[PDB]
Amino acid sequence: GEVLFAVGGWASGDAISSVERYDPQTNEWRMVASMSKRRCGVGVSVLDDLLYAVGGHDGSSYLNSVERYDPKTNQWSSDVAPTSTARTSVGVAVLGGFLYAVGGQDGVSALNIVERYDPKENKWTRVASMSTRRLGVAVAVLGGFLYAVGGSDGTSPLNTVERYNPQENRWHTIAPMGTRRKHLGCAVYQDMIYAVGGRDDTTELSSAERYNPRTNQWSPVVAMTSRRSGVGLAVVNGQLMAVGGFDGTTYLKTIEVFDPDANTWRLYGGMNYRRLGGGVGVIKM
């Protein structure tokens, strides 16, 4: 019994600050309190049951602030300590009770820096930079181990993957993906790391790949219904689904769910807002 939050920031042209919640109980996509400031290309990941939204473009300012959201009370608070530098199109994940925010874009030369966050102290301190700059990267965590999947450096989209050990504070490159993917989506379905969608060197795309943590090799996966660049992906009370994105025509608001026993994707109704590059969070209630 989980729910998926969606914190998007791309539509028509203007960034958006509306936040959406899906509960499978009623199977409805009803809204919640919008974010106190628009965030374009957000990073979000829940940290002990509080949705965290790490800054991004608001339509003009790239921005460095952070906002958390208490889902039980429906309240957004801009009280979390800011970041070192203003950056957008950055993935974030949670691990060992600390909030890691990987590299992104800041209107100059991508970024490879990675900074943590102590929720108990609000310090927000920086750990080991990443090597190979990554904007529009998606992240995931398998085996207490923080993975940075794909993205774009200063010039081209990447197929390389770098994993991080918090205790030794250093990065270790691992198996490159099949295809180059910037603005992809990742979660940790079925004790493997699935990555779907994105945009390669040319066009948006629908292929998908799974990484086996125990063989250290990526395995191609069945493709989605439509191309979906700048998407999110999260596993909700059992089922893997990707959300929103772009496909070379219009902003998407639909979601697809992976059925492993049938090895295909099934389009569902989807959310209200058409979301490009919009983070997702998952909470159990």
From Swiss-Prot:
Kelch repeats lie at residues 3-49, 51-97, 98-144, 146-191, 193-238, 240-285. Induction: By hypoxia. It is found in: Cytoplasm, Perinuclear region; Nucleus; Golgi apparatus, trans-Golgi network; Cell projection, Axon. Substrate-specific adapter of a BCR (BTB-CUL3-RBX1) E3 ubiquitin-protein ligase complex involved in interferon response and anterograde Golgi to endosome transport. The BCR(KLHL20) E3 ubiquitin ligase complex mediates the ubiquitination of DAPK1, leading to its degradation by the proteasome, thereby acting as a negative regulator of apoptosis. The BCR(KLHL20) E3 ubiquitin ligase complex also specifically mediates 'Lys-33'-linked ubiquitination. Component of the BCR(KLHL20) E3 ubiquitin ligase complex, at least composed of CUL3, KLHL20 and RBX1. Interacts with PDZ-RhoGEF/ARHGEF11, DAPK1, PML and CORO7. Interacts with F-actin. Interacts with IFN-gamma (IFNG). Interacts (via kelch repeats) with IVNS1ABP (via kelch repeats); this interaction blocks the assembly of CUL3-KLHL20 complex. This is Kelch-like protein 20. The lineage of its organism: Eukaryota, Metazoa, Chordata, Craniata, Vertebrata. The gene is KLHL20.
